[PDB]
Amino acid sequence: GFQSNAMKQETPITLHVKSVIEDDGNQEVIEFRTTGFYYVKQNKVYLSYYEEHDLGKVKTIVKVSEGEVLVMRSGAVKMNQRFVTGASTIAKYKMSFGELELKTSTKSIQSDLDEEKGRISIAYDMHVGHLHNMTITYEGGT
């Protein structure tokens, strides 16, 4: 019943999330580090952690499948961002005071994941309508 019951190989991890972004002439590299958990449900890998937004705490669950990654944010930002290689998806970016649809066009996804270390790399374009290369890496421990 509870999703916690189906969690296998739960492992505390240290995470590093790095994005290279280009937007109408501007270039930025943004990265963050925090701790969290690696686990498996129904033979798919999940990463769970929290991140900080200006408006407060966000809970983030990353679900990795063949050819697709789902990043579920909740709390100060609510968005289920669905990365599908070679396709575009739309999702609501919702805050306490309103919402806006964002379109995600994914070019490529690479993942290599286990309970000791892993990497997910996603190249994608965003817009309200912005080139992004996001790499999530983690190591088991602390």
Would you state the torsion angle of the CA atoms of residues 72, 74, 76, 81, taken in this order, to the nearest 10 degrees? 20
Structure tokens at 104: 């995600």
Q: Any idea which residue has 């995470």 for tokens?
A: 15
What single DSSP character describes residue 22? E
Q: CB under 8 Å to 111, separation ≥6 — which residues?
A: 45, 64, 69, 118, 119, 120, 121
Distance CA 70, CA 31 (A): 19
Q: 106 near 120, Cβ under 8 Å?
A: no
Class of domain 1-142: mainly beta
The approach used to solve this structure was X-ray
Amino acid at 34: T
Give the three-class secondary structure for 4.
Answer: helix
- Residue 109 and residue 114: Cα distance in Å, rounded? 17
Q: Which amino acid is at 45?
A: V
* Resolution of the structure, angstroms: 1.8
